[PDB]
Amino acid sequence: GSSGSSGMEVAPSFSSVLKDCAVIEGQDFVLQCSVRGTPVPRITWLLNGQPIQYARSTCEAGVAELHIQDALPEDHGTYTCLAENALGQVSCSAWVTVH
Numbered sequence: 001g002s003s004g005s006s007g008m009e010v011a012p013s014f015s016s017v018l019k020d021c022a023v024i025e026g027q028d029f030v031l032q033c034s035v036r037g038t039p040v041p042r043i044t045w046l047l048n049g050q051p052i053q054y055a056r057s058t059c060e061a062g063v064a065e066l067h068i069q070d071a072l073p074e075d076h077g078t079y080t081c082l083a084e085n086a087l088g089q090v091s092c093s094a095w096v097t098v099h
Contacts, residue, residue: 011088012037018079018094023071025098030067031079033092037062041083041090048077071098 016034023029035041043064045052057066064081079094 009087010036010038012041012083012085012090014083014090014092017092018081020095020097022097022099025071025073027071028069029071029096030065031094031096032063032065033081035062035064035083037083037085037087039085041085044082046080047075048080073098
């Protein structure tokens with residue numbers, strides 16, 4: 001036998017990666033996805049480059065969300081949601097379009 005305890009940590013992963021989405025200039029759009037892991041991986045969104053500073057992201061029940069109000073024509077790019085923890089590290093990309 002071997003001593004052990006139930007309820008061990010886990011590595012980060014994306015069950016439902018982000019998908020393409022379109023929105024009208026001036027409208028609101030929140031990027032919702034699914035990510036698992038333990039402990040909860042760090043959620044940081046970036047605009048095809050540097051991380052966002054005015055992002056009120058909200059991770060609940062392993063659900064990373066990013067509310068983006070005032071969809072500007074200069075936002076149309078590729079949102080990257082990095083998720084890493086003491087266990088592993090993973091990242092995903094997305095494609096948001098602004099009419």
